[PDB]
Amino acid sequence: KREHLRAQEEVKRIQSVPLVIGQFMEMVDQNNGIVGSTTGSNYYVRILSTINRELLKPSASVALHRHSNALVDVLPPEADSSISLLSQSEKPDVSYNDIGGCDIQKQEIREAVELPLTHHDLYKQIGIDPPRGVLLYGPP
Amino acid sequence: LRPGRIDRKIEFPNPTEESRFDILKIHSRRMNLMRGIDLKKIGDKMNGASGAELKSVCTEAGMFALRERRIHVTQEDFEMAVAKVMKKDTD
Amino acid sequence: ITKLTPTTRVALRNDSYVLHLVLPSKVDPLVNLMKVEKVPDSTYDMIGGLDQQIKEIKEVIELPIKHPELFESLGIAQPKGVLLYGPPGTGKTLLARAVAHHTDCTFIRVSGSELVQKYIGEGSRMVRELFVMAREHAPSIIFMDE
Amino acid sequence: SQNEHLKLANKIFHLTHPDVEDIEKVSLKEEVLSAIKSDFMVSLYETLAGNGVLELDQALLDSMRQSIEDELKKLDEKIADAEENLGESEVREAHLAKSLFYIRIGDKDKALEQLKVTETKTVAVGQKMDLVFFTLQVGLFDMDFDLISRSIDKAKNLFEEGGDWERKNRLKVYEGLYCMSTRDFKKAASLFLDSISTFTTYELFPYDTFIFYTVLTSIISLDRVSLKQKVVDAPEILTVIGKIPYLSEFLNSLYDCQYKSFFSAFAGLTEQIKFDRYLHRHFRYYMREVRTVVYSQFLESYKSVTIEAMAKAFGVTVEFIDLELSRFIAAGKLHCKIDKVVGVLETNRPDAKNALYQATIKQGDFLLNRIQKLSRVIDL
Amino acid sequence: LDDKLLLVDIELLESKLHFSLRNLPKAKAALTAARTAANAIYVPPAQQGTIDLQSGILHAEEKDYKTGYSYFYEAFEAFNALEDPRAVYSLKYMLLCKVMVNQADDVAGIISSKAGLQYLGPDLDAMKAIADAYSKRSLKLFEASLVNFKAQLQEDPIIHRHLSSLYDTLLEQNLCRLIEPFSKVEISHIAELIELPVDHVERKLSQMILD
Asked: Which chain B residues are Cβ-neighbours of D208 within 8 angstroms?
């Protein structure tokens, strides 16, 4: 038992400090996987047992040893998608009444989008399957 | 159009009321109706538009029902949405 | 070696690039093309007011599916061409979908796009590209929009 | 078909429950009016044994077991023509509609092997989910309380793709009649709104009758904030129970605090509850919960009212009230405390701690009874 | 004749007639028909505001207050866009709907709105007084405002038809205020505090417990 307590030494060694980018794609089995790497190519390596194996099976951001290029930890999502919710900075603050009445021109479509977004229970009980996405189209 | 190319031909004629009844029974089957439907009259109001306009009308009915957060679109809501579908049909 | 399916993924060592293990389920290009298509899977019982056309399509194609000996006794050629015409999207699209649904055939409907071309071939000089995908999935049907 | 199965079941069950419905005679006539026609063979051999002799039924059977065979052999004249030029397994596809005949005509065995046959046939659920409803309805006649537990989940797993509200709101009726058929009056009130929005099938053609049914379970399941919800249900009753003089007077007397006339129609409903099928397993449990709900509604309205006031305003018989309130306080409910020789009833108020602790120690003993007995059974 | 504008006008008048006749079902059917016809034509803002106002009135009558809420904001926007004095009645109906939703606090916020400031009037003062009465849960100023703003409240048939329910709710909430300082209380004491007869207090508290 006093030795298996040293089974945080494996964690310490693995984690290290200089970890690189990665992406979780799938695993051959436990303690075995093939990853998706930023290097454009793919390499398959083992896993870091000292982790929540059930993290993100589809895709994520994992690490790799400079030489071994193997996951030793998994950081949070960090991308160049920018601060989407930039509060006032990314906030148009535009009067709903925009360039003309557009009372059914686009108002009803926006209302349907808001009903799928906020009244989720409503677009759910009825079973009407609200639309998937909004792609604006019209004269330049 | 060579006779040996098209082995057989099948056309999709515009459904009539006799055909729209089953179309309605299929389309509204997934909706939350009101006790008592009376879809026969509505299909009568449907003057054989197409095999898709019925789908929108059935879907469009839920539009008003959501607009009032109603828990079931009664024969009034489907009737109203029928005009909106035909409103686009007449444009 | 035989178990190692050609055009399939197996593990590869790094210092040696020697075989390490097989890769289970990497990809199926036809499945990807179909997913890009996003076909509206239907059901024969959900067919709207085209019962006679339903039997015609069955008698048109499906007959040499559950009974390939039907035309052998009569000595007639296998039907080749079937087309859906009439008012646009009058359920003809839905009738086609339900056909495969109740028939269990590989549905592939194309609109002549270019993204799917990346899976058929590098240049797609001729229209035989789709056949190659179908040619190994014999239980398939072909649908083409207007 | 299984759509009038309602007639069969209800009629025969009335004839068999309530001590054979007085002098059993018109029930064995009108069921036999439906038995020796429409090709019924199997479900009434012991019902003939529960009936009289009816000595010559042999020619009555032989004309029908032949008519059983004539529909059976035309399947046997269809299964070879449907396979020579196959549609979508038109052998099965013919008798996927004619198994429900053979479900009515035969027993469950000709149904269960043909429904699970055609369950692998159809690739869309719109024929699958109607087969599952057929499995539910036979699961009520033969009261297959363990076979309904499987296919209800197997039903419910199908509705989520699509909305299928005629396959959902119809489904809510089936749990509603199941949660009331056995002791679960809680979910009965669930399908109350479900019935508000449902429709009239062959079983329940009378909307007013379905409406009244959704009211007997509501007056137990919910209190009077939810009985203001039930007054919204009573505007729904001005819509439907406005045709009912009995049930309108019965529900509103509890709401209008017309306490004395409340028992008058309660005697009517409970007698009707006895002769009715499917409430007759629990008609004695209903009123003793409706008595204790009518008592404590009045008693919670005072710190303490005398015991001789409830005779002339609530129900006559002072000593009748005496023996009734003595057996319910001793039963551990109806939170008050009666005095005897100064002739008064006093109430108290306990917290929701002692009574909430009481139901916990029942379930904790019950679950530990389950797992201690289990761990002895396994591992020798 | 397919004269959809005139058809909508006639159907709205017909709906108003049966609203006056207290025949809510047929009035609602008429309103639905009018909205269906209007959906086929570009309705002028005044007329569209008229349908919004009438729909709000019918839905509020049904006691479905949030829908009439939304409908009367539609109506106020429509009328204020036209500076039509019926925006004034639209404002009153919105404030009624809010006060009925137990959100009496929002009355002060709405009144301070730019649109409200344009329409300051004795009737708006009536609405503010009603909200104030609702806020502190006291009936006496409710009678005081009913007497003070008689010209504003009772002669309006729509307002009068809900004055009763508002009176009742004010009774209820003032009673709830009054009972909190006790766990036991004498009924006559409650009566004198509210100066309503002991028998009515007893009956209404019995109803509250039943509710």
From this structure: none
